[PDB]
Each structure stands twice: as structure tokens, then as C-alpha cells.
Design a binder for this molecule. Structure first.
Ligand SMILES: O=C(/C=C/c1ccc(Cl)cc1Cl)NO
Ligand SMILES: [Zn+2]
Length: 402
């Protein structure tokens, strides 16, 4: 019926088949508070939680869901009911399993899980310490709570329902997404809507068709930004063509990313190489830790950053391992490469989308599968990306008014 386990006995990334109504347990279902009344959240994997709520939490200005760019869509009512929250959670779950079904997705999600935000929180130069906004408070059934570090939170969108994004809490002094440290990433995302694009496929009287973006591709896109931002190698959003940012071109990948000139790219690579050397020096100068042995935590970050260690125990950045990690996160993890792996239809450049928004339901296996998306094998929808064609597969896409 839902199709969460097409091969084997159990899901391979997501740890449980949650229902929204499952009681809180303080372990993988808990009321949590972000650095607000608590919100029910689900731990889908080590370091990754899902909050099936509209994001009225992360940005203080954006506390309401009413209307005050090309395409936007508002419904204050979306994701207000337990049934919707259940369907959100199962849809996100399904999309994670779809991403993890690919070699590329397994590489990306591993990198994300391993990309623990750096403990650069001390004003004492020789002391390691967590940064408080890289945690959440996990309330237990008896009301006690513990702070838990995490890497990624998937949350529902704020007022603009199709405004998907990867954001995070800043430091008053540190630029965490651009200094190698990284920070917990919050992805505003809905599996219940998608957007359109036009494509002309190839009998002769077929003009341009109207297709829908596969929401596994959209989520992977945001997961790719999360990877850059967790290893603190995001491109400054003030770097743009004008509009499309360098960071978006990089993340879309394919030919779009080739418009970032190689001289520019060499410059960023060197910049972040030096930021990683700074992290190795800081770890080396560390003498104490607050809030696990110092030796243990240093090693956590040697593991994250692929640091080399001599017989003294001194760390250094290896140039070949740095290049590997940097190339993985920035060149190999791209929307274009996920498109190739999924074998789905996608727009051919970042800006080439329609001002068309659709309600979808990906949870029923009769609508969308982990292996095929909307393009269900052994049906009319396997041919010519007909499952993503909003005319042919009209039952799966309800066009919304912009
Ligand atoms: O790139 C984005 C969002 C992109 C986006 C959001 C909404 C629509 Cl309709 C189309 C697009 Cl390409 N977030 O990282
Ligand atoms: Zn993006």
C-alpha cells in the first residue's frame, strides 16, 4: 500500500516506520524545542530528525502563515492536522528511501551523517565546546530533557509553501557555513507539492509537454546544500549571476556549474583548504573540553574532515584527501547526477521552470514508488516520462492557483 520496503525486510536508511500518533518515547519520538511550545519530532536516522510542522520557529520575522518572485503559493491551513502530519512523515520517509536506493544517495547521506558541526564554541582558544544552536532539547515522557546534537532537520515550509530551502542558525562572529565548521541544517520541504517545467521530448505533432518535478530530486537538491553547509564550504550567497547564485549553479550541477570559471573554483578550493588547516591547528591547540575525552572528540573531527595524524597525535590536512572530500561534496553530489541515477525527467537548467504548482500525494504505492517515482514500470506511465506528464498522469497532479 505505501511501498516503503520494495526489497528486503526493512527500510535501509530510515530506522522505523513511524505513524504520527505513535506515543513519544524520548528516543526516536519526542517533543523537542529548537535553540516556542515543543513540537513532536521523529528521529529517522542518527543525526537526522523530522518535524512535520510548518516552520514558524526558525526565523523570528516569519512567525505566521499568511501572505503579505516568479511562483509562490500560500495556504495557512496546510499541515495543521494529524492526518496531514502523518502523510508528511511517511512521504519524507519514502523520499529518503528513494534517495538511499541509489549509490549516489548512499554516498551523500553518509557524508551528511558524518558531517557533525564543529565544536568551535569556546571563547577560550584552547578549549573545545559545542555550539548551542547545533543542538535541540529532547523532552522525555516524564518531562525531563537532554540536549542532543544533530546534523539535519527536515521541517515543513513557512508561509510560502513552495519556497524550499536549506537554512541554519548563525553565530554572532563565526560564519559557520563558510569557515569549515558547519552547523545543523534545517530543510524547509514539503513532499505534498511540486512545481512544473516545460519540455519538448522528440509523433511529429507533439509540441512542448508540461511536466512535474520529481520531489526526490528536489529533496536531494536541498540535501546537497546541507552537505556543503555541514562541511562549511557553502559559497557566499552574494556571489551571483545577474539572478542565480553560484551556490545554486553548483548544486544543480551539470552544465550550469560550468559557468563558474575554473579560476574562481580554484580560488574557493584554496580558501576552504586553508579553513580546514585552521580547524586542524585549533584541534592541535586544544588542551581541554567542556560539556567524552578531549582525545575522543578530536578524533570525531579527524574522522569528519579526513585529517591525517602523526605519531605525536598532531593533525594535518592531507591535500589529496581534501580534494577528494571537496570534489565529492561539490562536483559529485549534484541535482544533475541524481537525475541521471533516478532516470527521471528534469528541467535542463536551474531557472527554466514553470510558474505552475501542483498538489501531489506520493505516499500511495499506486501513485509513486521508491524505484520509479511517478513513472511506474509496466504501465503507460513508464513510457516518455508519462507519469511526470501532468496531462497524461493528471490524477497525480492538481494544478494550484498561484
Ligand atoms: O533552490 C532552491 C529552490 C528552488 C525553487 C523553489 C520553487 C520553485 Cl517553483 C522552483 C525552484 Cl527551482 N532551494 O535551494
Ligand atoms: Zn538550491
Amino acid at each position: 500500500s505505501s511501498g516503503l520496503v520494495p526489497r528486503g525486510s526493512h527500510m535501509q536508511f530510515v530506522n522505523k516506520q513511524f505513524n504520527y500518533k505513535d506515543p513519544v518515547n524520548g528516543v526516536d519520538i519526542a517533543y523537542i524545542k529548537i535553540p516556542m511550545q515543543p513540537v513532536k519530532a521523529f528521529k529517522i536516522h542518527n543525526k537526522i530528525w523530522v518535524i512535520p510542522e510548518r516552520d514558524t520557529f526558525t526565523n523570528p520575522e516569519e512567525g505566521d502563515l499568511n501572505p503579505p518572485v516568479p511562483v509562490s503559493y500560500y495556504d495557512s491551513t496546510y499541515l495543521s492536522t494529524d492526518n496531514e502530519k502523518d502523510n508528511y512523515l511517511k512521504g519524507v520517509t519514502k523520499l529518503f528511501e528513494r534517495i538511499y536506493s541509489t549509490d549516489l544517495g548512499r554516498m551523500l547521506l553518509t557524508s551528511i551523517v558524518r558531517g557533525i558541526p564543529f565544536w568551535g564554541g569556546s571563547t577560550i582558544d584552547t578549549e573545545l565546546k559545542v555550539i548551542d544552536t547545533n543542538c535541540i532539547n529532547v523532552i522525555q515522557p516524564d518531562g525531563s530533557y537532554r540536549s542532543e546534537e544533530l546534523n539535519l532537520v527536515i521541517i515543513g515550509p513557512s508561509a510560502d509553501i513552495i519556497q524550499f530551502e536549506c537554512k541554519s542558525f548563525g553565530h554572532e562572529v563565526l560564519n559557520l557555513t563558510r569557515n569549515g565548521y558547519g552547523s545543523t541544517q534545517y530543510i524547509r520541504f514539503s513532499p505534498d507539492f511540486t512545481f512544473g517545467f516545460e519540455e519538448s521530448l522528440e509523433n511529429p505533432l507533439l509540441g512542448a509537454g508540461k511536466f512535474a518535478t520529481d520531489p526526490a530530486v528536489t529533496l536531494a537538491h536541498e540535501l546537497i546544500h546541507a552537505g556543503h553547509r555541514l562541511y562549511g564550504i557553502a559559497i557566499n550567497p552574494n556571489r551571483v549571476f545577474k539572478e542565480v547564485s553560484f551556490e545554486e549553479l553548483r548544486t544543480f550541477g551539470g552544465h550550469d556549474a560550468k559557468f563558474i570559471d575554473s579560476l574562481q573554483e580554484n580560488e574557493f578550493r584554496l580558501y576552504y583548504y586553508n579553513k580546514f588547516k585552521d580547524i586542524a591547528s585549533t584541534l592541535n591547540k586544544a588542551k581541554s573540553i567542556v560539556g567524552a575525552s578531549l582525545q575522543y572528540m578530536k578524533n570525531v573531527f579527524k574522522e569528519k574532515y579526513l585529517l591525517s595524524e602523526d605519531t605525536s597525535g598532531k593533525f594535518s590536512v592531507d591535500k589529496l584527501k581534501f580534494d577528494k572530500l571537496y570534489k565529492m561534496l561539490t562536483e559529485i553530489y549534484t541535482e544533475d547526477n541524481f537525475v541521471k541515477f533516478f532516470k527521471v525527467l528534469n528541467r535542463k537548467t536551474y531557472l527554466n521552470f514553470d510558474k505552475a504548482v501542483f498538489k501531489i500525494n506520493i505516499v500511495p504505492k499506486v501513485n509513486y514508488t521508491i524505484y520509479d517515482g511517478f513513472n511506474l514500470r509496466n504501465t503507460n506511465l513508464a513510457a516518455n516520462f508519462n507519469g511526470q506528464n501532468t496531462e497524461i498522469n493528471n490524477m497525480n497532479f492538481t494544478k494550484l492557483k498561484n
